[PDB]
Design a protein around this ligand. Structure first.
Ligand SMILES: NC(=O)c1ccc[n+]([C@@H]2O[C@H](COP(=O)([O-])OP(=O)(O)OC[C@H]3O[C@@H](n4cnc5c(N)ncnc54)[C@H](OP(=O)(O)O)[C@@H]3O)[C@@H](O)[C@H]2O)c1
Ligand SMILES: NC(=O)c1ccc[n+]([C@@H]2O[C@H](COP(=O)([O-])OP(=O)(O)OC[C@H]3O[C@@H](n4cnc5c(N)ncnc54)[C@H](OP(=O)(O)O)[C@@H]3O)[C@@H](O)[C@H]2O)c1
Ligand SMILES: [Ca+2]
Ligand SMILES: [Ca+2]
Lengths: 401, 401
């Protein structure tokens, strides 16, 4: 009754995406899908127009599911003969939608973490706006002065700052963020943690960046005091600012069960460290949530798995883990279901997640999880299923459920 | 015959520092020491002049050992009634000396890592110059335009970049780095890895910061090709650039035995994550090495342990781990010894490190390491020694050795 926006992708994830749709989704669910092909080739052909069209379609319809895509760089420009080094589609969509990207591991009882203390999941809430990701940078090739100016819109004295006099070359960068965006990030994070009844931590480096990072600290503190502190206390949870240095140490030590609000760059980096620590990138989920909770975009917290695609391309069997991709579909459909008051669709999504977990906990799993259990040296082919075998096995149990 | 420059510090580390000197160093070694008290109180009193004097003394004499110090922030300004929010002494010294800070864990056979894959130490080489640590930032409180200008020193068109038009407040920041400093960082890292015969990785985000981070990538690549590639290949090692996202995942997965060159901020953050993953900050070493290897500053890879100092202040027994601090002294004295051709001093330093490791591997250890072995819930007072008991035990075995 509502529509689901689908964004097709690249390389190994695109092949798996087709299998997931045809095997675990379309046989059981009839939902109207608006489709956008975000393959590298179609982005180049459409001069990246598909990307922004897809983003606006998610805003219109309320829910999107996205397959991993290639982010061009020098090598990719050569590989595909790109017209331009097109921007990351993820940055474009997240820019258009706004919001915070919540990343969380999927834990199976029988798959150990790499970190021995980790008992419960940790959620990273990544601020998907500003800083490095909309920065302007340049190489300095001659002697000269880098300075910044702030120019008030009502005339009156521009403020100037001399940063550096280069003599023998270097680099320069400026970046910004906004009160509006920081306040939206804070609200998303307080709301997420409150719904979970988990505590909340914000990491910054305000110790060095007294003004830039101090703005994050002050905005979260203001918002906690005004709007959330009483509700948090009543639920037996709390919010705390932490020095980024201390926070990464805490994360190693802690058993989990907290929400961790991260600035754009820290969320990007620490999410991968977290994912890998929990066992595998194939078991890490990602959901962008707009401020208010009414628009989401769900994806796997990993890329296109091009190393595996290379093996796929030369006819070799691959056991890349489809679980995060499937959970993208289940959580997107669950959001679609709730808006639509469709309890049977919602129950289907829960049931598919349940059988995936049951399947793995009983010993049927892809090679990455076999490795977490046995160690890379000790796994043999009979210890795991290939990707299609894993998905076929899941559909079997799904059909009895 | 040469002189050792000593920089006294703050809180818990200052108390331990005195005990280390009096118990494990001065009874066995006669080296001239030039002393600088970098306590919070003496930095305030001298308007931070002691800090820069101490730094220049290290440059003059070639070797410094430093105790952890307080870096002022808003709360510390109130606590000590500081005249100003003085800059981090570590940033000041590292600024004055130049160089790369190499951070490495001390592994004991019987103390497990938190990360189950970790077998050998990892060395982080932190670039101790530029980026966030010499950046200019500001809060924007009115509508206005942030722009950057590059002004060539030979007249002729300034290059201008419009970054943002603020309407409802935000933040702005500019930062730089230099070709000279990046090239010194690269050389330190290639040399360090080559002497170890370990491979070398550089992490960047050149995927987003094409110019700023691309400069790091290009400089290391240029230097490898010109100066190190053949020597690395001949030793069976290599150098590789890595996306920071991939690199933190690699670090979780890998058994260790590589050098990891990190930009200023990444080195700061990832060093603490690494340290904690290996078991305890009390077992992480830090050495600043200038480009050429002729000036060093050695310290513990941790702060003043103020949480423990708080307990110390109210007469409670503390078991803070002195090992990193002692290794600061041993590695500083070893550098002093090599310059001076003093083989007996060098052998003493090696012997003290040896007995510290032997002491722990036989079950005599501070509370942090007991916790790594037994789990926090299961440790009881008889499982560990307090700090002085640990140091006294070490001196005992040292005396028979
Ligand atoms: N959201 C997105 O659209 C997104 C996000 C990140 C990257 N990317 C793009 O994806 C492409 C490749 O990026 P990347 O190699 O840096 O990261 P990646 O695709 O996440 O793969 C990195 C490595 O992590 C492991 N891994 C990731 N997903 C896995 C899964 N489902 N099952 C098992 N193992 C998995 C694999 O290790 P082994 O090879 O050791 O098995 C893999 O080679 C690039 O073009 C990048 O731009 C897209
Ligand atoms: N090089 C330097 O001079 C330097 C470096 C960093 C920080 N600092 C300064 O040091 C002060 C405190 O900083 P911080 O609390 O962020 O970091 P910290 O002093 O490293 O202590 C953080 C926590 O790590 C654990 N830890 C650190 N060193 C330890 C040791 N030797 N033995 C056992 N456990 C240890 C303790 O955990 P538990 O409390 O859980 O036992 C401790 O509270 C601040 O004023 C900061 O500015 C100085
Ligand atoms: Ca990433
Ligand atoms: Ca630090």
């Amino acid at each position: 009754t509502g529509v689901l926006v689908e964004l097709d992708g690249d390389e190994m994830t695109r092949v798996i995406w087709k299998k997931i749709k045809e095997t675990l989704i379309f046989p059981f669910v009839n939902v109207p899908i608006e489709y956008y092909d975000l393959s590298m080739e179609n982005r180049d052909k459409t001069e990246d127009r598909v990307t922004v069209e897809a983003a606006y379609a998610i805003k219109k319809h309320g829910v999107g599911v996205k397959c991993a895509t290639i982010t061009p760089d020098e090598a990719r420009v050569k590989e595909f003969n790109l017209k331009k080094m097109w921007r990351s589609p993820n940055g474009t969509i997240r820019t258009i939608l706004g919001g915070t990207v919540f990343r969380e591991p999927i834990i199976c009882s029988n798959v150990p973490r790499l970190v021995t203390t980790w008992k419960k999941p940790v959620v990273i809430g990544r601020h998907a706006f500003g800083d490095q990701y909309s920065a302007t940078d340049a190489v300095v090739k001659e002697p000269g002065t880098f300075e910044m100016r702030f120019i008030p819109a009502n005339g009156g004295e521009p403020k100037v700052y001399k940063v550096f006099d280069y003599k023998s070359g270097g680099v320069m960068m400026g970046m910004y963020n906004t009160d509006d965006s920081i306040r939206d990030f804070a609200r998303s994070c307080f709301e997420f943690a409150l719904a979970r009844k988990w505590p909340l931590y914000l990491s910054t480096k305000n110790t060095i960046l007294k003004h830039y990072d101090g703005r994050f600290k002050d905005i979260f503190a203001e918002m906690y005091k005004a709007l959330y502190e009483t509700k948090f206390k009543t639920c037996g949870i709390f919010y705390e600012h932490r020095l980024i240095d201390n926070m990464v140490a805490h994360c190693m030590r802690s058993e989990g069960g907290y929400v961790w609000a991260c600035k754009n760059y820290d969320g990007d980096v620490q999410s991968d460290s977290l994912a890998q620590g929990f066992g595998s990138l194939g078991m890490m989920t990602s959901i962008l949530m707009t401020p208010d909770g009414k628009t989401v975009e769900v994806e796997a917290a990993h890329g296109t798995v091009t190393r595996h695609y290379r093996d796929y391309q030369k006819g070799k069997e691959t056991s890349t883990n489809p679980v995060a991709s499937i959970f993208a579909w289940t959580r997107a459909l669950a959001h679609r279901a709730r808006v639509d008051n469709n309890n049977t669709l919602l129950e289907f999504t829960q049931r598919l997640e349940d059988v995936i977990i049951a399947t793995i906990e009983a010993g049927a799993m892809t090679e990455d999880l076999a490795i977490c259990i046995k160690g890379e040296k000790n796994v043999v082919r009979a210890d795991y299923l290939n990707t299609d075998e894993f998905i076929d096995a899941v559909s079997q149990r799904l059909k009895v459920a």
